[PDB]
Amino acid sequence: IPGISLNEDNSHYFYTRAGRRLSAEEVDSWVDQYAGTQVKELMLCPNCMRTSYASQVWDPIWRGYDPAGPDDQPLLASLPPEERVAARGWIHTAWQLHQDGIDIYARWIRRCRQRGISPWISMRMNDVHYVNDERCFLHSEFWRENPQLRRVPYRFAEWTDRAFDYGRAEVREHHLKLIRELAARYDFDGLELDWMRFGFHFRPGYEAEGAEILTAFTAEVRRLLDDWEKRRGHKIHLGARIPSRPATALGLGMDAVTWARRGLVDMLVITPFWASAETDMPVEIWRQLLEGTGVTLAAGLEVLLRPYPDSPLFQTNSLETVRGAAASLLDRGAQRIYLFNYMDSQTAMEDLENYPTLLREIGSLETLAGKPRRHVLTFADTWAPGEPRAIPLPATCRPGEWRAFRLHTGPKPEPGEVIAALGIEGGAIGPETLEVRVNGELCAFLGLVDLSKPRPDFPVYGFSVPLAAMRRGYNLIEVTARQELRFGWAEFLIRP
């Protein structure tokens, strides 16, 4: 009964259905796969710097597009020939829908309402994909012509260096124009301000003035949607995506506790940016901060599952690791599981065969109960400028030294097997090279563990955990090495 909020990105549908000539019936069929699942809300993203619909205030993705022309036309000249094909799929499918008199977002909203799903619009507030290519098709002409509106003029080390500065009245006006348009065009249940595309909105050093500035913006948005409530005759929700820790969120000019205490929002999605799902987020701290405000707190998953920022492995979550992250977060008081980049194809779990089951299981502790789950150690990808970073892996243990890893495993396990699994990097070990304890109790050596994906490219060794040692919430692995060893992977496997 917490349920699932699921995000469809601005590009996916147009890329993956490219070359078909979609009937209204096919377009509608896309909502149906989520019908009768634990999905309460579809968060339909219509935009990056450009819209995928036929906007009158912003650039549609096809601004500059010659439908009858060759791939190397001006709009696409800047990509290599292979990506021209990919990008033209998105551009051409979205344009061809428009020419057919099909508004994909109005169709999806109307289909959502018929199948008993609450339809949301989620707006990217500051997308910067491929801003290293200034002639790139998916940039607004507003962006292209106003380099003086970028947050970091003195350097280009990162895409977020060329993000819009919401410190500028013209940047806030530009984004308010789209919001005004979306609220007039579409009869949604909720607008979501996706601050986490890409989370960086201000000059470095200006984030405190920043926090005042996004609070006043969110209030003007709330007052706008109030007026539309009278025009639509129903309640219209305002939500926001924000970083996973309060100090990083406030540090990036997002004071959500103020937004919450003032009734500017009624839903908040704590999340990482992209580099990995966080399996461990301070949900109970947020619940205390948000107490009495009646905001829905949603715990945001990402599709990738990676042990540390510099890992060369890029694989996704499986049903077992999502079950792990969901069991844990629901257990900490998350009032929704929010999925991002978990779409029906291309950007999606690698075990796509299990997507129907996933959408029917991870919205409730009751449906995850007695089901195999995996609780993997990852990291927070997002930090405020100069904010000290806390990255648990990789971690070297010298001989005679102790290291501890805490992992949140949500509800006390059902009867069955519990394994503490540790990945060792650099080419190793015997049964006594590690001494392993969970909550102080000695674990038996099991041997090499045959992990299914996601998995590291180095040996993972299993330690058997006395079932009685396992506790509700955090469980503490404490290891000592008799040989210098570097860990690059840690999880609990639970098999009821």
Ligand X SMILES: O=C(O)[C@]1(O)C[C@H](O)[C@@H](O)[C@H]([C@H](O)[C@H](O)CO)O1
Q: What is the DSSP string of 107-148?
A: HHHHHHHHTT-EEEEEEESS--TTTTSTT-TTS-HHHHH-GG
Cα separation, 494 vs 430, whole angstroms:
24
**Minimum distance, C-beta of residue 1 to a copy of itself, in the bound complex (Å):** 24
Chain-centroid distance, C-alpha 489: 22
Please say which residue, 138 or 418, places its beta carbon nearer to a copy of itself.
418
Choose one: 138-146, 149-157, 215-223, 418-426; the region binding a copy of itself (CB under 8 A): 149-157
Residue 439 binds which entry of a copy of itself, ligand X, none, CB below 5-8 Å type-dependent: a copy of itself
Cα separation, 270 vs 196, whole angstroms:
9
Peptide bond between residue 411 and the one before it cis (omega within 30 degrees of 0): no
**Minimum distance, C-beta of residue 15 to ligand X, in the bound complex (Å):** 7
**Minimum distance, C-beta of residue 422 to ligand X, in the bound complex (Å):** 30
**Minimum distance, C-beta of residue 478 to a copy of itself, in the bound complex (Å):** 6
Amino acid at 152: V
Using CA atoms, how far residue 63 sits from 95, 174, 306, in Å, is 9, 17, 37
Cα separation, 79 vs 158, whole angstroms:
19
- # residues contacting a copy of itself (CB under 8 A): 55
Contact residues toward ligand X (CB under 6 A) are 9-12, 48, 127, 129, 138, 197, 274, 341, 347
Amino acid at 434: L
Residue 229 binds which entry of ligand X, a copy of itself, none, CB below 5-8 Å type-dependent: none
Residue 478 binds which entry of ligand X, a copy of itself, none, CB below 5-8 Å type-dependent: a copy of itself
Q: Give the per-residue contact string, 266-285, with a copy of itself (x = CB under 8 A; - = no).
A: ----------------x-xx
SS3 220: helix
Residue 226 binds a copy of itself (CB under 8 A): no
Cα separation, 389 vs 379, whole angstroms:
10
Cβ count near 272 (within 10 Å): 23
Residue 341 binds which entry of ligand X, a copy of itself, none, CB below 5-8 Å type-dependent: ligand X
Q: Give the per-residue contact string, 401-440, with a copy of itself (x = CB under 8 A; - = no).
A: -x-xxxx-----------------------------xxxx
Residue 234 binds which entry of a copy of itself, ligand X, none, CB below 5-8 Å type-dependent: none
Amino acid at 50: R
Q: What is the DSSP string of 299-345?
A: EEE-SB--SSTT-S---B--HHHHHHHHHHHHHTT-SEEEESS--SS
Q: Which two tokens stand for residue 88?
A: 């033209």
For residues 284 and 331, the answer to whether their CB atoms sit within 8 Å is no
Choose one: 105-113, 198-206, 421-429, 445-453; the region binding a copy of itself (CB under 8 A): 198-206
**Minimum distance, C-beta of residue 459 to ligand X, in the bound complex (Å):** 31
Give contact residues for a copy of itself (rule: CB under 8 A).
152-155, 157, 203-209, 245-247, 250-251, 257, 261, 282, 284-285, 288-289, 291, 379, 384-392, 402, 404-407, 437-440, 442, 469, 471-478, 480
